[PDB]
TrEMBL record:
Entire protein: shown range: 51 to 349 of 561
Protein name listed in UniProt: Endoglucanase
GO molecular function terms attached to this record: cellulase activity; metal ion binding; polysaccharide binding
Organism this protein belongs to: Streptomyces thermolilacinus
Binding positions for Ca(2+) 2 per the UniProt entry: G226, D233, P234, E236
Keywords, ordered alphabetically: Calcium, Carbohydrate metabolism, Cellulose degradation, Glycosidase, Hydrolase, Metal-binding, Polysaccharide degradation, Signal
EC number from the UniProt entry: 3.2.1.4
């Protein structure tokens, strides 16, 4: 038995040890020059980074050599690597958005560089791959993309984002999760909820996470916020506490470089200059410094 995989609703390393993501998102595709971000993120205690890629539909395609380099750099910094295609974001509502099938073709094109990296790399098929229009339409192409990647021979653990821009507020991923999970013959599939202003009360967070846990289905919070936006105030204190209580993975949005800097954890990619949001995530109660454990595949650091 090798590779990251799912068993009993838990993400396990090849050696069977439970792995709970404690990390952040890094916007690699828009910031190719910010090479030190991965080392900086590791130094602040993260055990996982979610790396923003483009499949070229909307932004500039990250080619195989670039992706190979990203994977190697994650391994060099003793980080588990969640790769994700951002171009799918908001499909049906964002005009520029790409399809999950287009993302799937891109992943298949990367299989030579993904090969042998199942201990380190999780494939998040497409970011937030449906908007708020007809979110029930998300299920069929998500299932099709899962089946297509498995048919192509991809063995990595998969990660699945929800419609309603990843916040699933109409409950489609929650309702249809069992059918999506069953589309993966290997069972190595994670669901990912994104929590922004929909998740502005503790009960919304607890009930959502517990719905997956109580169903036996694996869930991570693959992107989440904290500072208020135009739709409300995300309750990040409950996100962090509930994720620790249930020992579910989380990945804060984002290291640095947002067009609106309100969600930058670090200001200007400087790890010593954390925003209030960055301080909360890295140094606060139930945060990364407190609760992140390195993946055991890397061994005991000298
Ligand atoms: O130009 C040269 C320059 O380029 C630079 O690169 C730039 C890139 O080209 C690109 O423009 C990039 O843009 C980024 C941006 O910087 C951010 O990083 C952004 O991060 C997102 C991320 O995806 C998060 O996961 C999350 O995603 C958000 C969406 O962004 C969006 O806000 C959406 O909103 C939903 C919401 O989720 C909810 O459903 C709500 O429902 C409402 C509903 O509308 C009703 O009101 C109802 O009553 O209530 C419900 C419930 O509230 O609807 C809204 C939609 O209307 O939410 C999702 C999460 O759910 O947020 C992050 C912040 O947005 O991604 C962008 C790309 O997608 O920026 C680059 C930097 O500028 C560099 O290369 C530079 O060097 C170069 O010079
Ligand atoms: Ca709410
Ligand atoms: Ca908040």
């Amino acid at each position: 038995v090798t590779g990251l995989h799912v068993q009993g609703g838990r993400l396990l390393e090849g050696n069977g040890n439970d792995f709970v993501m404690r990390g952040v998102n890094h916007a690699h595709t828009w910031y190719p020059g910010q090479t030190r971000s991965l080392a900086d993120i590791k130094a602040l205690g993260a055990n996982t980074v979610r790396v923003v890629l483009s499949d070229g539909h909307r932004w500039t395609r990250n080619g195989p050599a670039d992706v190979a380099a990203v994977i190697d750099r994650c391994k060099a910094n003793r980080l588990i690597c969640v790769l994700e295609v951002h171009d799918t974001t908001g499909y049906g509502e964002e005009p520029a958005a790409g399809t999950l099938d287009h993302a799937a073709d891109y992943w298949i094109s990367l299989m030579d560089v993904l090969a042998g990296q199942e201990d380190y790399v999780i494939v998040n098929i497409g970011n937030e791959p449906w908007g708020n229009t007809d979110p029930a339409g998300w299920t069929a192409p998500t299932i099709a993309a899962v089946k297509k990647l498995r048919a192509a021979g991809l063995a990595h653990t998969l990660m699945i984002d929800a419609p309603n821009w990843g916040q699933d507020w109409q409950g489609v991923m929650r309702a249809d999760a069992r059918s999506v999970y069953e589309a993966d013959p290997t069972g190595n599939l994670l669901f990912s909820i994104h929590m922004y202003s929909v998740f502005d009360t503790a009960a919304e967070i607890d009930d959502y996470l517990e719905a997956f846990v109580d169903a036996g289905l694996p869930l991570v919070i693959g992107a989440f916020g904290g500072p208020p936006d135009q739709w409300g105030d995300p309750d990040e204190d409950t996100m962090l506490a509930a994720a620790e209580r249930l020992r579910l993975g989380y990945l804060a949005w984002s290291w640095s470089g947002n067009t609106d800097p309100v969600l930058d954890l670090a200001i200007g990619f400087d790890p010593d200059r954390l925003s209030g949001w960055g301080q909360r995530v890295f140094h606060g109660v139930h945060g990364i410094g407190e609760t992140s454990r390195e993946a055991t595949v890397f061994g005991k650091l000298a």
